Write a protein that binds this DNA or RNA. Structure first.
Lengths: 197, 387, 242, 120, 331
RNA sequence: GCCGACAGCGCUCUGGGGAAUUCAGGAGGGGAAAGCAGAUGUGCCCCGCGGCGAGACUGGCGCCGGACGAGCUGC
RNA sequence: GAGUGGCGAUGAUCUGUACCCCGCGGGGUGGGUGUCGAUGGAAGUCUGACCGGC
């Protein structure tokens, strides 16, 4: 769009008119501008292909495992599917394994080297263990991994709110469990007056 | 006894009244160096009579390119008619301090009653001005918005380019990064096009046997759609695609007539035609880059392209960085970048050096000189071919 | 020796913004790359991430008198991240790129050169880096670029002129601060080819001294150059920053 | 582009004579490529080019690296005079001449680039 | 900061008028407590390092409203021989210190010119005016104000000094050329109103010289027609308008500005049988002009702006009013 | 890497360390118009001293100098 | 009697991509490469009964 206001919020486009005024613009020809402009339309075409690929994978994962989608979402669950290979081969793995999917180098480094195993793997970029912080991160990594072995096991061995009857219960229990973990009082402390009394 | 002086800076002119003038005998004294060192004392010596900005960077570039040779402009004579009093040299004159001797002589030539001490001559106004240059940020801050260093920086790029004629004959940019993106997206279209061949070929096997040339595969599986709705000569396309009557189309509709593999669904076919439009738009943009890239390289450095071809001349110009660097390398350093093979490697390396510096250090370089370089290349090919 | 891909750790040098990269059989003086991923004139450089980003161009005492002085054992170089340096005799902007790597993004290098061709390579490098200004003018006429240069902290001087102390004299009398840095490379064969080099060096020091500088130290660049001196002095004060 | 043009009143003659004497002391790198190697390696003490080059762009590249290495360069107006000044039987287009620790030739290089410094 | 020292000079300089206000029955003693303490707080705020033109105008507004308060309270208690000149002198001190510290502040400069004009300080007003022009020479606001107040005072030569130096400097916008045609033709309006003046080739020289300028464009020339299109009661307004339309139809002859002045040209010397006569003449030029091959959208927008630009007038044929509304609908 | 006798050496002693804060100093950086050298309200008119200044004469040897002056302005 | 063709600083030559088996021709593994693979290997997929409130 440059060589108006839909692409970006205003008063930053006032700054791009300002830098367009006072910048060090080496006036290249319109043929070279046509080349860099066709690279721009190339990469915004790949951005549109990103959008419809993302909607493809979201709707497809909703059709394949709705328990997973109504726990952690299509992207993270899709990457678990991609790690173990398939849905039944994800379902044959225990809940600790589905906690440690994605962290096997640190994990067998720790197990062969007598050190601290990793608390989580792929799971960390879900909408919940990112919502928690502190020790609640590893704790809700455990219990989310247990409930998610359970839910992907239901999706893998059998309108959509009866097919997704495990994931909604695990969302309610697991987010209620979140706020009872986080919204907690601190350690009880005495108060002292001006004199140490 | 200096009355006024003139500080000319990259944002504009500004002339200062000076009152409580400097110790003209004790200039090298340390306490006077302190009073010429800190702002809270020298500013008791200088006021600010007038400021004259630049209404455009074109006026700034003409202002440097007059004031470097030492000629004043008509707007400087304007601001000095604005500021200086109407004096002949009859009975009362006005001393102005100017950092340049010929500007002083021209300015006493234009104004007969000004008399100008130049900072090349007298250390009084050389110091009284040198300190306006020290504090002229804080001295001008109350009326000039923004920093001075960026206006300096842009004015220095502007004056260097206007004095040297830089970007009228510096066009290296459009092939180093262009062959970077050209080989990059050739790798990309091999990757994604191999993907769409693997997956639609997972749906429909023998199209790998009838149609190779990966991007033509991608367009023919954009157009063929599903295994179901085929006619061979459907709409105005397959004659421009490939052979039609005896060779390909009967193998297409016959191959899907005797098709063997798995079926597929509609949204999956939306993936194969979004991915197909990905690959074929990538190929169209590759045609655009090869066209404008080869035209541009034959319009900028033709010698390396006639003796080598623009993909490998593009690889050497991106491989050394610029025409100035590849020109600066010697013969055997370009040879870095039985005995017949390495011998002609040395010979074409040496001619690629001589073609490099003849390619750069002409103004807008020609074409026939590299043509006669390839004439020497052909007669050395014949010089071995007498065997 | 210093082959591409050898593991080599980087520790800071004694100066401000100068780095030293110690490897197994060697060591390499290096600066921090201001524009990453790009070598200026085709030099070796070092990439490292925080525990993509960090990059260190390797700096050559055979192609740079200032690196010959830093490996020559110089006390101070007067330049630090944040300084303003007036470089004199800037051919192609190579050592101007290393000075620009020292003073960094907030600093400013004011590169002056007479020749138009080194002007062009200087505009290439100085178009890539945004703290260096290109000035293609005569160093014997400072009133040409008096509209371009403010009061700088340091002047670096590498010109092959017989009137070198006069050129740096008037450039410091227009552009160098009260108590300013000056760092001059001197070629005795270029000033006086029939005199002994210690006497040429001492005479150029005396011309700066009656040009009202104050010489702090002198070192000769002689495992890396021949008959070259590096004189470090300070304008109008005995101590630098004032 | 030959702004350090040497004058035919015997400065060219002293240049070509010192070329010949350095050729007899083997201090002489002949031709544009070997000149370029001597300047880039920094061995060079002085360098002469020839302005009788038919395209002069093919020797215009070494004043850049001579400005970088700070060695004096100067043009003589005949590559044939430079060529038999070297003693080559071909046309030498650009010559570079180095030095050592102790030679009267090194003294002649010193006085010669003193004259070249009087040009530039 | 020695703000207590320099502030101590200004407070102790202010003290004997407070003495005279306590010994006259005008203010009372705790009022003078509030007054001394507030004077002090302003003087330390103003002589403080980090200050603003807002702060200087706050203390100018408060000190001057103090002078008006003492004036009205003086008129209450029927006092005479108490004067305002320590307040005016003091206010000139606040301004002189103000535009000495922040001289690049046209709020301060225009406010100081406003005070110097409201206290009838004319010679001092011109000195402030020249200092303001020297620090802001690219300011059409200041060059216009100097030229116009010089014209209303009556020295048109000094007005033309401020204007011709102004047109020398402010040459990005057309604004000061418009105000010098506007003020020079204001002077010709005064000369033909009192009746060189018979010819009046000065704004024509402004026009033809103004051709060679970096602003000189067709829309700006239409702003020249908006300037000259008033004062149609003159001697040579048809000659000046006719030179503008003729020269634009000799240099830019394919522009809806030239077609727009081709419409509005017979309506210069009007304000009445000629008003429908030249109005329908502008309908002949209008129908001749809207069909012309030019920037038809720009002429359509100009004529929506012009047919809307007549509507406030009265005593018109309602058929003409409605048919111009339908012409706005038709375009 | 911890521990380390004897012999010897150095620093220090209201023994030796660490943290929290209260007080007394020192050095350095960075930021800041950071600017009280003579601090007299405004406007008009008359005088005095002076500055620009059109235009006009003259003496001496191609110059330098005298001495007139419409008008406008500063103090 | 006329018109063409002809190395080299505007870079000749030389040590140096390996060894071996044969009659300028052919073959056994190189090493560095640059790809896509691959099923193949390193390579195996944490702990398991308490904890919080009062």
């Amino acid at each position: 769009a440059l060589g108006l206001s839909e692409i970006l919020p205003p008063e930053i486009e006032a700054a791009v008119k300002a830098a367009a005024d006072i910048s060090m613009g080496t006036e290249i020809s319109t043929e070279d501008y046509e080349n860099i402009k066709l690279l721009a339309v190339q990469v915004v075409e790949r951005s549109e292909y990103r959008r419809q690929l993302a909607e493809y994978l979201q709707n497809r994962m909703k059709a394949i495992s709705p328990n997973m989608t109504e726990l952690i979402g299509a992207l993270v669950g899709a990457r678990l599917i991609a790690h173990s290979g398939s849905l039944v081969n994800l379902a044959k793995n225990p809940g600790s394994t589905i906690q440690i999917l994605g962290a096997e180098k640190a994990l067998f480094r720790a197990l062969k080297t007598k050190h601290a195993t990793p608390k989580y793997g792929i799971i960390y970029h879900a909408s919940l263990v990112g919502q928690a912080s502190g020790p609640n991160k590893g704790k809700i990594a455990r219990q989310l991994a247990a409930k998610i072995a359970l839910s992907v096991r239901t999706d893998a061995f059998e309108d959509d709110e009866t097919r997704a009857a495990v994931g909604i219960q695990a969302r309610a229990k697991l987010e209620n469990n979140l706020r009872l973990l986080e919204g907690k009082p601190l350690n009880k402390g005495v108060a002292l007056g001006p004199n140490g009394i | 006894v200096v009355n006024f002086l003139l500080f000319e800076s990259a944002v504009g002119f500004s002339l200062f009244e000076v009152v409580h003038q400097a110790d003209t005998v004790g200039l090298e004294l340390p306490e006077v160096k302190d009073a010429m060192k800190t702002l809270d004392k020298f500013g008791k010596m200088v006021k600010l009579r007038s400021f004259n900005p630049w209404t455009s960077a074109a006026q700034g570039l003409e202002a440097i390119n007059l004031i470097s040779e030492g000629i004043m402009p008509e707007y400087l004579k304007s601001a000095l008619e604005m500021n200086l009093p109407q004096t002949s040299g009859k009975k009362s004159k006005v001393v102005l301090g100017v950092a340049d001797k010929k500007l002083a002589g021209e300015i006493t030539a234009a104004f007969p009653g000004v008399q100008c001490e130049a900072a090349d001559t007298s250390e009084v106004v050389a110091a009284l001005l040198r300190g306006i240059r020290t504090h002229a940020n804080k001295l001008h801050k109350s009326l000039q918005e923004g920093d001075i260093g960026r206006a300096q920086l842009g004015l220095g790029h502007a004056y260097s380019r206007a004095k040297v004629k830089f970007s009228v004959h510096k066009n290296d940019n459009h092939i180093i990064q262009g062959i970077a993106t050209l080989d990059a997206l050739d790798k990309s279209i091999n990757q994604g096009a191999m993907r769409v061949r693997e997956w639609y070929g997972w749906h429909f096997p023998e199209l790998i046997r009838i149609v190779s040339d990966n991007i033509t595969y991608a367009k023919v599986v954009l157009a063929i759609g599903n295994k179901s709705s085929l006619t061979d000569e459907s709409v105005d396309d397959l004659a421009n695609v490939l052979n039609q009557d005896q060779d390909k189309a009967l193998a297409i509709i016959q191959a899907a007539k005797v098709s063997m593999g798995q079926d597929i669904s509609e949204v999956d076919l939306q993936m194969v035609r979004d991915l197909a439009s990905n690959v074929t738009s990538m190929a169209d943009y590759r045609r655009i880059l090869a066209e404008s890239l080869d035209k541009k390289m034959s319009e900028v450095a033709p010698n390396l392209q006639v003796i080598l071809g623009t993909p490998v001349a593009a690889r050497l110009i991106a491989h050394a960085g610029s025409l100035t660097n590849l020109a600066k390398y010697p013969a055997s350093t370009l040879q870095i970048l039985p005995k017949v093979k390495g011998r002609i490697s040395r010979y074409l390396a040496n001619k690629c050096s001589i073609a490099s510096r003849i390619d750069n250090f002409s103004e807008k370089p020609t074409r026939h000189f590299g043509e006669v370089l390839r004439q020497q290349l052909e007669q050395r090919l014949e010089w071995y071919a007498k065997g | 020796g210093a082959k591409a891909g050898k593991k080599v750790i980087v520790e800071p040098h004694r100066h401000k913004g100068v780095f030293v990269a110690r490897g197994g059989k060697e060591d390499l003086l290096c600066t921090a790359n201001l524009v990453p991923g790009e070598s200026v004139y085709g030099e070796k450089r070092i990439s490292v991430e925080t525990p993509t980003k960090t990059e260190y161009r390797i700096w050559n005492p055979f192609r740079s008198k200032l690196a010959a002085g830093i490996l020559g054992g110089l006390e101070t170089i007067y330049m630090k991240p944040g300084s303003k340096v007036l470089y004199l005799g800037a051919a192609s902007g190579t050592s101007v790129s290393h000075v620009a790597d020292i003073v960094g993004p907030t600093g400013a290098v004011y590169a002056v050169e007479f020749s138009h061709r080194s002007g062009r390579d200087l505009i290439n490098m100085a178009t890539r880096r945004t703290n260096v200004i290109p000035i293609v003018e005569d160093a014997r006429k400072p009133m040409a670029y008096r509209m371009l240069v403010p009061m700088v902290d340091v002047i670096f001087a590498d010109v092959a002129q017989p009137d070198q102390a006069r050129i740096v004299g008037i450039n410091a009398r227009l552009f160098l601060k009260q108590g300013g840095g000056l760092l001059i490379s001197i070629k005795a064969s270029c000033i006086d080819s029939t005199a002994p080099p210690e006497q040429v060096f001492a005479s150029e020091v005396q011309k700066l001294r009656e040009d009202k500088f104050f010489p702090k130290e002198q070192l000769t660049l002689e495992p890396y150059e021949r008959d070259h001196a590096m004189v470090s002095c300070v304008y109008l004060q005995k101590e630098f920053e004032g | 582009a030959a702004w350090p043009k040497a004058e035919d009143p015997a400065l060219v003659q002293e240049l070509l004579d010192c070329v010949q004497q350095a050729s007899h002391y083997r201090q002489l790198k002949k031709g544009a490529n070997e000149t370029t190697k001597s300047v880039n390696r920094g061995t060079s003490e002085l360098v002469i080019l020839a302005a009788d080059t038919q395209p002069l762009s093919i020797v215009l590249h070494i004043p850049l690296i001579c400005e970088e290495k700070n060695v004096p360069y100067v043009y003589v107006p005949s590559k044939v005079a430079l060529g038999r000044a070297c003693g080559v039987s071909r046309a030498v287009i650009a010559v570079s001449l180095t030095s050592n620790e102790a030679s009267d030739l090194n003294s002649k290089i010193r006085a010669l680039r003193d004259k070249v410094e009087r040009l530039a | 900061a020695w703000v207590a020292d320099k502030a101590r000079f200004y407070l102790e300089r202010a003290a004997p008028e407070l003495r005279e206000w306590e010994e006259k029955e005008i203010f009372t003693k705790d009022e003078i407590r509030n007054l001394v303490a507030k004077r002090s707080d302003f003087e330390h705020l103003v002589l403080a390092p980090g200050t603003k033109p807002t702060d200087f105008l706050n203390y100018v507004n408060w000190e001057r409203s103090l002078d008006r308060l003492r004036a009205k309270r003086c008129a209450r208690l029927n006092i005479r021989s108490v004067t305002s000149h320590a307040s005016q002198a003091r206010t000139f001190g606040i301004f002189e210190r103000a535009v000495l510290k922040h001289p690049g502040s046209i709020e301060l400069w225009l406010a100081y010119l406003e005070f110097a004009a409201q206290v009838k300080a004319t010679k001092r007003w011109r000195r402030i005016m020249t200092r303001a022009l020297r620090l802001h020479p690219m300011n059409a606001s200041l060059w216009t104000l100097a030229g116009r107040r010089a014209a209303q005072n009556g020295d048109m030569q000094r007005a033309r000094a401020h204007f011709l130096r102004g047109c020398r400097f402010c040459t990005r916008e057309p604004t000061l050329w418009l105000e010098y045609a506007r003020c020079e033709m204001d002077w010709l309006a005064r000369m033909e109103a009192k009746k060189p003046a018979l010819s009046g080739a000065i704004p024509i020289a402004v026009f033809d010289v103004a051709r060679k300028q970096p602003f000189w464009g067709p829309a700006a020339a239409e702003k020249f027609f908006d300037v000259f299109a008033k004062f149609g009661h003159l001697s040579c307004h048809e000659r000046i308008i006719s030179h503008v339309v003729t020269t634009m139809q000799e240099l830019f002859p394919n522009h809806p500005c030239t077609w727009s002045v081709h419409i509005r040209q017979p309506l210069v010397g009007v304000d009445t049988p000629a008003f429908p006569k030249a109005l329908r003449e502008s309908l002949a030029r209008l129908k001749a002009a809207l069909q012309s091959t030019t920037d038809r959208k720009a002429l359509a927008t100009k004529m929506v702006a012009w047919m809307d630009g007549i509507l406030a007038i009265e005593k018109l044929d309602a058929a003409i009013r409605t048919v111009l509304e339908h012409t706005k609908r038709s375009l």
